[PDB]
Amino acid sequence: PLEEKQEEERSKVDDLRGTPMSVGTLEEIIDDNHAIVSTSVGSEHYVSILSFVDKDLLEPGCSVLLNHKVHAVIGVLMDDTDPLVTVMKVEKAPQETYADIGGLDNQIQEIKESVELPLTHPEYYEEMGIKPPKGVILYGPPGTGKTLLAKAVANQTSATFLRVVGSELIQKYLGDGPKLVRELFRVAEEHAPSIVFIDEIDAIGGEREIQRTMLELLNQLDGFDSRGDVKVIMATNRIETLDPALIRPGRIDRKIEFPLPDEKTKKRIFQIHTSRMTLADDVTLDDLIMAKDDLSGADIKAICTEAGLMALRERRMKVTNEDFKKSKENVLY
Amino acid sequence: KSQNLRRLQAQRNELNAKVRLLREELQLLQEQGSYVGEVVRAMDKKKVLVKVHPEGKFVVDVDKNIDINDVTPNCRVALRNDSYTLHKILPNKVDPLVSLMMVEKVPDSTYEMIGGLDKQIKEIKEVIELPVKHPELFEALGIAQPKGVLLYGPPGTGKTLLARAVAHHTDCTFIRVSGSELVVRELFVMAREHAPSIIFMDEIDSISGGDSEVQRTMLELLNQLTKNIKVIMATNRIDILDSALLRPGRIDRKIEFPPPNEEARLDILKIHSRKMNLTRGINLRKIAELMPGASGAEVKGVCTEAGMYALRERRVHVTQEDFEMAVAKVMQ
Numbered sequence: 001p002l003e004e005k006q007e008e009e010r011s012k013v014d015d016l017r018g019t020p021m022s023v024g025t026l027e028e029i030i031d032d033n034h035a036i037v038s039t040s041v042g043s044e045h046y047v048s049i050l051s052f053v054d055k056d057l058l059e060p061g062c063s064v065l066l067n068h069k070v071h072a073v074i075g076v077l078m079d080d081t082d083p084l085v086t087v088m089k090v091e092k093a094p095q096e097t098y099a100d101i102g103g104l105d106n107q108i109q110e111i112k113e114s115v116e117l118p119l120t121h122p123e124y125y126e127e128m129g130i131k132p133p134k135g136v137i138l139y140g141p142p143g144t145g146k147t148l149l150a151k152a153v154a155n156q157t158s159a160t161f162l163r164v165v166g167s168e169l170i171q172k173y174l175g176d177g178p179k180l181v182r183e184l185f186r187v188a189e190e191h192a193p194s195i196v197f198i199d200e201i202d203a204i205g206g207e208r209e210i211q212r213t214m215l216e217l218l219n220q221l222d223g224f225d226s227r228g229d230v231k232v233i234m235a236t237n238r239i240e241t242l243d244p245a246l247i248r249p250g251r252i253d254r255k256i257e258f259p260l261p262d263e264k265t266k267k268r269i270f271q272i273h274t275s276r277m278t279l280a281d282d283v284t285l286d287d288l289i290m291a292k293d294d295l296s297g298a299d300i301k302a303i304c305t306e307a308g309l310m311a312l313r314e315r316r317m318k319v320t321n322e323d324f325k326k327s328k329e330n331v332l333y
Numbered sequence: 334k335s336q337n338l339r340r341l342q343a344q345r346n347e348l349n350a351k352v353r354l355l356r357e358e359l360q361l362l363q364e365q366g367s368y369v370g371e372v373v374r375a376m377d378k379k380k381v382l383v384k385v386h387p388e389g390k391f392v393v394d395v396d397k398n399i400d401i402n403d404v405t406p407n408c409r410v411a412l413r414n415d416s417y418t419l420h421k422i423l424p425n426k427v428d429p430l431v432s433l434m435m436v437e438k439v440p441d442s443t444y445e446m447i448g449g450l451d452k453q454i455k456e457i458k459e460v461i462e463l464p465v466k467h468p469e470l471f472e473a474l475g476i477a478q479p480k481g482v483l484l485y486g487p488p489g490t491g492k493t494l495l496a497r498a499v500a501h502h503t504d505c506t507f508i509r510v511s512g513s514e515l516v517v518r519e520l521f522v523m524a525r526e527h528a529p530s531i532i533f534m535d536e537i538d539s540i541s542g543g544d545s546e547v548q549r550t551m552l553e554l555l556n557q558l559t560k561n562i563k564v565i566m567a568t569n570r571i572d573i574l575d576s577a578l579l580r581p582g583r584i585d586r587k588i589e590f591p592p593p594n595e596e597a598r599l600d601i602l603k604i605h606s607r608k609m610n611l612t613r614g615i616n617l618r619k620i621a622e623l624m625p626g627a628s629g630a631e632v633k634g635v636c637t638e639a640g641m642y643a644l645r646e647r648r649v650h651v652t653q654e655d656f657e658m659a660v661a662k663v664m665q
């Protein structure tokens with residue numbers, strides 16, 4: 001009968017904890033028996049504490065709650081009401097695999113160890129001796145692999161997957177900006193382990209707020225310690241633009257890159273998208289390999305999408321490769 | 334006599350009930366007044382976590398006849414009269430977007446009155462209600478998803494009105510993030526809640542990184558993404574914008590708006606002339622005769638000015654010549 005002393009709470013204790021309880025943000029904790037609380041008004045209140053409360057969320061001062069008539073620290077602030085509601089802590093994963101990336105294979109192999117292998121087989125390293133490396137940069141030309149594809153596939157066989165972008169990093173109003181990456185590497189740090197994406201950092205459009213912001217992804221990356229803070233994966237189109245302070249092969253570890261396609265991935269990456277389609281009689285490479293004298297990774301995505309759509313305006317799931325030509329002149333000409 | 338007597342009993346009991354709740358009404362109003370406020374919704378045994386109007390927080394209880402199971406977040410109603418405990422529910426009180434729609438009341442209901450655009454509405458209806466109301470032929474045609482349409486044209490002539498009209502033939506929604514005055518990433522939640530949505534943009538160059546930043550900012554979340562949300566960007570020129578948007582296909586659709594020719598301007602001037610009285614006969618062609626570079630607006634303007642030039646002589650029928658001094662006035 002271990003559940004006998006639980007019901008004394010709702011007749012001797014919940015009479016104290018269970019009223020129009022108020023919520024005011026906690027302040028500098030004077031030692032055990034008390035605390036000070038600035039309430040919702042702004043009036044400080046030297047409150048007491050509770051004996052039975054299992055106090056673990058004392059940090060001067062997350063929104064603690066109080067009693068109405070008497071003043072105390074009655075409960076705590078589960079239902080945290082998470083700042084950065086929409087940062088994509090992925091629960092429903094997207095639709096990319098090891099197979100549909102299918103092109104650059106060296107690269108997805110290298111990022112596959114550099115993010116995934118301290119998770120899918122972490123018992124290489126301490127048996128071998130080395131530390132696991134930190135996050136990569138993976139720069140490239142535009143459309144050369146969807147830079148944000150070999151990180152997306154690094155999503156869907158791991159734990160949590162936190163991202164950022166150059167746009168969430170910079171700020172208008174701010175004057176006070178480098179806060180975003182304070183609590184981005186504080187929320188990022190908290191999951192243990194989560195991967196933070198500095199999606200396309202390229203910082204263009206005074207200047208000194210951008211300077212201090214870059215200095216705080218810099219320092220807030222590697223100041224004094226780190227939790228499981230692999231995933232700092234940076235996609236970039238302009239590697240020669242950003243200040244070479246990020247890479248002290250400490251702040252940014254080992255990093256992997258690629259030529260745009262070759263023709264082998266013009267074929268092999270062309271036949272992934274149109275594998276979903278229904279064209280079969282004259283699937284070609286003469287209109288694909290030397291057609292544009294190198295066509296992006298996307299231009300084939302847009303040639304499949306604009307191809308099937310342009311043969312879908314006239315309502316047929318048929319195989320016409322002359323409509324494909326109207327798709328070519330339609331999308332890039 | 335007893336039946337009629339019991340009818341008199343019904344009359345007397347009815348008037349006596351009137352004087353019941355009038356008498357205990359005048360002693361009744363000496364009690365309290367319940368508060369009111371939005372919440373972040375409950376977690377536990379009773380529970381709320383309210384935020385009342387003046388000072389925004391508390392956690393309160395709920396009465397037996399309230400059935401804490403339906404009372405969902407951001408649906409303000411309260412009664413913690415004195416001890417702080419709920420009673421009942423009230424008018425939902427228009428959620429968030431209802432705000433920035435009625436507030437930025439910019440979007441004006443439009444339906445099919447588009448002045449002579451049929452290739453344009455064929456192409457936008459090709460990519461704005463087929464990916465909403467018939468996804469079945471896209472998941473069997475091999476197409477992945479069409480999303481994102483860029484409306485490039487002259488200032489006027491198709492903007493804020495084509496993307497309005499085909500948003501509401503479909504009854505989708507029409508969220509506009511044009512401007513950031515009073516409140517990114519939070520808007521996505523609202524769009525997700527709406528389930529299906531359409532996001533619209535701004536076009537300012539003349540009538541450095543203005544809204545291409547948020548543009549991509551929501552194409553980054555939109556690329557990997559709870560699926561039937563379609564961003565729309567209107568710009569005056571295709572060349573002025575970013576090279577990052579120049580990434581086929583990032584903008585699955587580049588619809589083109591020309592300035593209107595003769596017959597399309599007799600169509601738009603036909604509709605805006607269908608706003609008012611005219612006369613036994615206009616034969617509107619002579620006004621369209623000098624349409625030469627016109628603009629959508631350049632037509633609503635001259636039709637209202639023709640109406641005012643009929644109004645100046647206290648006359649109740651818009652004649653022929655008020656058009657001629659309207660369009661012969663506005664050449665400025």
Ligand SMILES: Nc1ncnc2c1ncn2[C@@H]1O[C@H](COP(=O)(O)OP(=O)(O)O)[C@@H](O)[C@H]1O
Pocket residue numbers: 100101102103141142143144145146147148149235269296297298301580582
């Ligand atoms: N196997 C592949 N080969 C080449 N390109 C691809 C492949 N899979 C996806 N992509 C393209 O990559 C794009 C997204 O990532 P990326 O090309 O790096 O864009 P960006 O470089 O602008 O971040 C998508 O438009 C997608 O069509």
Ligand SMILES: Nc1ncnc2c1ncn2[C@@H]1O[C@H](COP(=O)(O)OP(=O)(O)O)[C@@H](O)[C@H]1O
Pocket residue numbers: 446447448449450487488489490491492493494567601628629630633
């Ligand atoms: N083809 C058209 N049909 C109806 N109205 C039009 C047309 N072209 C322009 N307009 C006028 O333009 C106004 C809508 O503004 P809009 O066209 O969105 O501005 P912009 O030209 O900057 O996109 C409406 O008042 C409408 O009468």
